């Protein structure tokens, strides 16, 4: 499927979750970032105004793109794969409560799932795998990517 045809992908925090501090939200979208830029030849930097590749959102329910939240648990966030437009954005539910730990549902981790999508990822069948498609807390502070993650964002980068 699509992937970016250039190494140097901006990003944009549309908005702020209430349930967490700012700097808190930054840091966990930009290491999730990291992740995918550690074995890859990608380059992300956060841009204040203006359009960016991946416009990162916190939405509930409807939020106008014909792909409808659910409420508190169920579907946690969704990205689009690359493109123009809403081509690699990653909208997360407000409806969940997002936090920097193992309480509610972790921010950093589901980003970096939806960002696998934001590069062109689909979901893998492997327990083991960040794009398996069901959420569990692992630490975060010695998270790393799968075998299956490394192959699959190596097969269409770098
Ligand atoms: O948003 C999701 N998932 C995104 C997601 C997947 C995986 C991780 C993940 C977290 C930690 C480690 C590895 C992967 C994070 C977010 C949800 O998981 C599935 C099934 N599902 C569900 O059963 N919810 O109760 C709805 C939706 O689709
Ligand atoms: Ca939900
Ligand atoms: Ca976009
Ligand atoms: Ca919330
Ligand atoms: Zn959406
Ligand atoms: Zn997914």
New binding site residues.
Partial sequence: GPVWRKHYITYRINNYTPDMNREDVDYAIRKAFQVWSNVTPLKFSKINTGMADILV?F?RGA???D?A?DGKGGILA?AFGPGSGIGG?A?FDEDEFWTTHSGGTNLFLTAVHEIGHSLGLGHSSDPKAVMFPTYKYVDINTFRLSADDIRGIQSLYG
């Fill in positions: 959102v939405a939020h106008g793109d792909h939240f969704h954005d909208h």
